[PDB]
């Protein structure tokens, strides 16, 4: 019983669901078809449970990485956008919504870490990681540090580790090779070594976590931090005069942050797949549709080229997209959980001195492929 003749959509409570409902009202004016938007608690946990029994919403919106698990269980319908429509979104976003080769969702928005800096302390942020040691000594002469960011979670340290060549799983020809892991290769070793060197050279502290770094930046103690769009409102409140820019390069290569793509999937059990496609393609994924959602709650950078080009007039959003285009789409496979735990341990151990960089990464690589 998935009520055919209408559309029921699930989206998280922190998104612009009121704006999404407005798009649904327009769809109804045009077609006479009602669209009901809901934002239940723990909807990402409820979806697999109810879709498994043939129930649930016609459409679900969530970060793409969770869709791999849903596709794994046959909960999502293969979508059918033609080449012309696919051409309206940035090509890399389509790589975040493929499972076993099949497209299983529509990309909506894009999120990645950026370099955030204090324009008063540093109106000219560094383009390379290599110049941060010198910069830190300079700022320290005035009682300020160059950079503080969360060193406890791989999500935040990976950009640097991947810069020169590290990667979670090799993706080539629309699919991941679970046996091809780039955690102990020369590039990862180079990046982690630079990170560890920053710590023993006293430019960064191995125990700095999310709260500590955010506090330091918003209090004007450090000139830079690395964070995502979810952190901007707290900085706005702090009144720090900040900028958001491209992450520094390492060995001349862009830092590579994981990319999260808010996406829309269609329930495999939905008797309204055609309605869903019409709604998603021709109402939501248009400048007018995304604008309606964005006005309610900002989407950040979006997958639709025409609207991203307008949003990008805000340099912070432009930065998010630039870093995302240079980043690594987050793998949507189950082995990614093994990657998180293993890398988390490797970095913590390398930073604390418990393990050398080579041994910490060697052990992590073994765990992930084992
Ligand atoms: Xe949305």
Curated annotation (Swiss-Prot):
Source superkingdom = Bacteria
Q: List the gene name.
A: malE
Query: Which GO terms are recorded in the biological process aspect for this UniProt protein?
Result: maltodextrin transmembrane transport; maltose transport
Member of which family?
Answer: Belongs to the bacterial solute-binding protein 1 family.
InterPro entries, sorted? Maltose/Cyclodextrin-bd, SBP, SBP_1_CS
Report the protein name in the record: Maltose/maltodextrin-binding periplasmic protein
Per UniProt, subcellular location reads as: Periplasm
* Entry function: Part of the ABC transporter complex MalEFGK involved in maltose/maltodextrin import. Binds maltose and higher maltodextrins.
UniProt keyword annotations, A-Z? Periplasm, Signal, Sugar transport, Transport
> What's a Pfam family this protein contains?
SBP_bac_1
Q: How does it assemble?
A: The complex is composed of two ATP-binding proteins (MalK), two transmembrane proteins (MalG and MalF) and a solute-binding protein (MalE).
Matches recorded under PROSITE patterns: SBP_BACTERIAL_1
Q: Which organism is it from?
A: Escherichia coli O157:H7
List GO terms (cellular component aspect).
Answer: ATP-binding cassette (ABC) transporter complex, substrate-binding subunit-containing; outer membrane-bounded periplasmic space
Q: Which PANTHER family match?
A: MALTOSE-BINDING PERIPLASMIC PROTEIN (PTHR30061), MALTOSE_MALTODEXTRIN-BINDING PERIPLASMIC PROTEIN (PTHR30061:SF50)
An example of a GO molecular function for this protein is:
carbohydrate transmembrane transporter activity
Write out the coiled-coil annotation as residue ranges: none
